């Protein structure tokens, strides 16, 4: 195994994802998301003009949503730190949802680490 530290890091994953209305009417709005190193950014569009908001992916819990989360959408997942905040994302396709849960999930999970079974 070998590592490599370089100035700017390449993109991990980028695609259109819907984020529950943080302060709306239980609605879903589309937004450009670009998974990064142990982090997840998003912009108004794929144009990547200016970063609107960022989401920390440290020790987070990313996985398929639950039936108790009042989520009436196929291929949807939730990401919460178990106290901080509970984010939600709906993938237009099933093949994507999974990909994400693992993409943004791994960056949040830590192998060979304590407090983990």
Length of the chain: 117
C-beta atoms surrounding 54 within 10 Å? 11
Can you tell me whether residue 95 is helix, strand or coil? helix
Residue 89's alpha-carbon distances to 14, 49, 75, 115, in angstroms, are 13, 22, 9, 27
Fold of 1-117: PH-domain like (2.30.29)
Can you tell me whether residue 91 is helix, strand or coil? coil
Query: Strand order in 61-64's β-sheet?
Result: 53-56, 39-43, 28-36, 13-20, 86-90, 76-80, 61-64
User: Residue 105: which H helix or E strand, with range?
Assistant: helix 94-106
CB 85 within 8 A of CB 78: no
Contacts by residues 60-68 (CB-CB < 8 Å, ≥ 24 positions apart): 60/104, 60/108, 61/108, 62/100, 62/101, 62/104, 62/105, 62/108, 63/101, 63/105, 64/97, 64/101
Rounded-to-integer distance, Cα 5 and Cα 24, Å: 41
DSSP letter for each residue of 6-53: -SSPPP-EEEEEEEE-TTSSS-EEEEEEEEETTEEEEESSTT--S--E
Report the candidate in 69, 75, 31, 83 with the shortest Cα–Cα distance to residue 53.
Answer: 31
Give the burial string for 78-90 (b: 16+ CB within 10 Å, else e).
bbeeeeeeebbbb
């Amino acid at each position: 195994g070998s590592s490599g530290s370089s100035g700017n890091a390449p993109v991990t994953k980028a695609g259109w994802l819907f984020k529950q209305a943080s302060s709306g009417v239980k609605q879903w709005n589309k937004r450009w998301f670009v998974l990064v190193d142990r982090c997840l950014f998003y912009y108004k569009d794929e144009k990547e003009e200016s970063i609107l908001g960022s989401i920390p992916l440290l020790s987070f819990r990313v996985a398929a949503v639950q039936p108790s989360d009042n989520i009436s959408r196929k291929h949807t997942f939730k990401a919460e730190h178990a106290g901080v905040r509970t984010y939600f994302f709906s993938a237009e396709s099933p093949e994507e949802q999974e990909a994400w849960i693992q993409a943004m999930g791994e960056a949040a999970r830590v192998q060979s680490g304590p407090s983990s079974g």
